[PDB]
């Protein structure tokens, strides 16, 4: 067999596929990750996730996203996509803006992306691409690595690659359980913030030269 | 008398006011630029503005916005904000991302900017900020100069900058032809884009410097 066990996380077992350029991949659910949309999060239950998920935003541990220096969430500005609403960050981050900012964060609502374990990112890194596969109903999308989950945990991607796959995108009730999602990882592509007609076209042409999603297909099969 | 007549257009009256940091300062109406919002422009009237307004978008003359070889409007992708829509264009950019990308534009939806006049920029330049203030409610947001509007008109902004002064924020029935509007540019104060944190800093401190939204509200019975 071309495939390998190299890992293993709540289940689902991943595997390094022989050949250039280097890939692993595992057949999975697809849970909803809505950090980095700036309407994830708000007062009141105001955001489309639950305020709780992010944390306490009256002073306690607030870790949905970035905090002032007394421990509250930021507030987004007049020049933000949802004034008023928390900034919600993700692992992966575009340097050109501030901590503060929601711009700095991946915009889930917007870009395809996917979310590793954490400790088991077998070698990729943020930033990196994926060609990303629902076997049921066969519609696939290019996606970068962009956040980190909880370790014991894995399936999970953006509202955006939701919508592409066909997957329920809503964050409170979205996703699915299923195993139904493949997703082709390949670790050490990027490794850096790029705008995501830079990430596409390359990971289109790692795809191409990897074999295509019909080989994805065929060695689906053995997931 | 610390104003000077430099210009007019439509009507209105184009000032310099004494003093430093250099600045101008017109009172007019708000017309509502929606260009740059990633929505605005669709196939069959989909946008939140009429689709003929950005021209032709049957392969004619198209000035919403960038065209593929053919003369046709550039659509969305699976990772720009609304795929399938058109990419509408504003005159400022932000050089990261390339030509066909909603993102290299100013979103009109989420970022405070002002119109100036064709030809009547009046020595400012692109990106540059001003102090936007409505008369009759009081309120007042920062913004940019962030495109360039029909030579023979004055007073128009973006659907935040609507939302920020109270104004109605509608690309098709909103905004206001009442002068009620007083726009203090400052000229030669950016010239280049910058993030929002940044020039929205910036032109909270040339305020500070030049005397403050008190003295804009005293100099606008002026006018």
Request: with cysteine; charged share 20%; glycine share 12%.
């Amino acid at each position: 067999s071309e495939l390998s066990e190299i890992d293993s996380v709540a289940g689902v077992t991943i595997y390094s596929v022989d050949g250039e350029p280097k890939s692993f991949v595992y057949k999975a659910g697809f849970a909803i990750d809505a950090d980095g949309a700036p309407n994830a999060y708000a007062p009141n239950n105001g955001g489309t996730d639950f305020t709780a998920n992010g944390g306490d935003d009256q002073g306690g541990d607030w870790w949905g996203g970035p905090v002032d220096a007394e421990g509250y969430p930021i507030k987004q500005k007049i020049f933000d996509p949802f004034p008023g609403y928390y900034v919600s960050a993700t692992a992966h981050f575009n340097p050109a803006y501030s901590e503060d900012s929601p711009y700095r964060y991946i915009d889930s609502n917007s870009i395809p992306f996917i979310v590793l374990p954490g400790n088991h990112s077998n070698g990729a890194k943020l930033g990196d691409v994926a060609l990303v596969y629902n076997e049921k109903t066969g519609d696939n999308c290019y996606a970068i690595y962009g956040d980190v989950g909880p370790s014991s945990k894995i399936g999970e991607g953006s509202v955006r690659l939701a919508q592409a796959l066909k997957i329920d995108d809503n964050p409170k009730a979205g996703g699915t359980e299923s195993r139904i999602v493949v997703t082709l990882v390949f670790p050490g592509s990027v490794g850096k913030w790029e705008t995501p007609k830079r990430w596409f076209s390359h990971a289109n042409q790692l795809t191409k030269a990897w074999g295509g999603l019909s080989r994805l297909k065929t060695l689906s099969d053995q997931l």
